[PDB]
């Protein structure tokens, strides 16, 4: 996933 979109 996108790390800057905190999962």
């Amino acid at each position: 996933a996108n790390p800057n979109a905190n999962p």
């Epitope: 996933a1 996108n2 790390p3 800057n4 979109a5 905190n6 999962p7």
Partner: antibody, heavy 121, light 112 residues
Framework: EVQLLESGGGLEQPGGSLRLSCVVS????????FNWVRQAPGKGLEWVAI????????YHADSVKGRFTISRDDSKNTLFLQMNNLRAEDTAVYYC??????????????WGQGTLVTVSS | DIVMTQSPLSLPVSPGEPASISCRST??????????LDWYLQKPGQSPQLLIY???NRASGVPDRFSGSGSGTYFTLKISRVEAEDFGVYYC?????????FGQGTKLEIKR
């Protein structure tokens, strides 16, 4: 004011090398992942690579794997893309970008202006 | 890889009329409680601009004409009433799995 300023592009022959640089200002560079995205003239956007804020996790796209290398120097708040063994189809505007940053329940996104790489003999 | 299919590829719309752009994935984009699909608008000679993030959330500064919807593999961006400045090419991109992939882009044209 956040600004992502790209440089290092220009003209190079096939098989040559270029090194792109993206200096990030007004932004906590070390805390975020960064991406490289390129766009061939008239064509669409293509994701190239990602490096996480850790620096140990990084990924490259299949089309450029083994030839391009993404890296970061956190001490200078700068992102790099080392381009070796350049091919004609690498001609594109290259953007550094965080892509989506989603934290404190708000969404933001920052992009550089892009720098043009032309690969031809 | 994951293939993002945008439809249509060209979208002529008169100003004031609604527009609808779809984005299809070959694999579910869900991770946790979010769908990792973003919508971008790129005007000629400019950098891409975030419009909708995580499938249905309007980015800061984007006008209320823009909205996003969908889940799983089917997502839709809608403009209730297009205006002159919304012309350009719209891209979706998934970030649920590397390699990140973009759609082909949808060119929103002026319907004369």
């Amino acid at each position: 004011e956040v600004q992502l300023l790209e440089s290092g592009g220009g003209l190079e022959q096939p098989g040559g090398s270029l090194r792109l640089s993206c200096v990030v200002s007004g932004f906590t560079f070390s805390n975020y992942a960064f991406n490289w995205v390129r766009q061939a003239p008239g064509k669409g956007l293509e994701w190239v690579a990602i490096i996480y804020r850790s620096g140990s996790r990084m990924y490259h796209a299949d089309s450029v794997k083994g030839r391009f290398t993404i890296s970061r120097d956190d001490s200078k708040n700068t992102l790099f893309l080392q381009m070796n063994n350049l091919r004609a189809e690498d001609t594109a505007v290259y953007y550094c970008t965080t892509l989506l940053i989603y934290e404190s329940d708000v969404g933001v996104d920052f992009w550089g202006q892009g720098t043009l790489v032309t690969v031809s003999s | 890889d994951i293939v993002m299919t945008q439809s249509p590829l060209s979208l002529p719309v008169s100003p004031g009329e609604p527009a609808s752009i779809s984005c299809r994935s070959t694999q579910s984009l869900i991770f946790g409680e979010h769908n990792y699909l973003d919508w971008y608008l790129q005007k000629p000679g400019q950098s891409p601009q975030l419009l909708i993030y995580l499938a249905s959330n309007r980015a800061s500064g984007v006008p209320d004409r823009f909205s996003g919807s969908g889940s799983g593999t089917y997502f839709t961006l809608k403009i209730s009433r297009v205006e002159a400045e919304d012309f350009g090419v719209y891209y979706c991109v998934q970030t649920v799995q590397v390699p990140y992939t973009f759609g082909q882009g949808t060119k929103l044209e002026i319907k004369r």
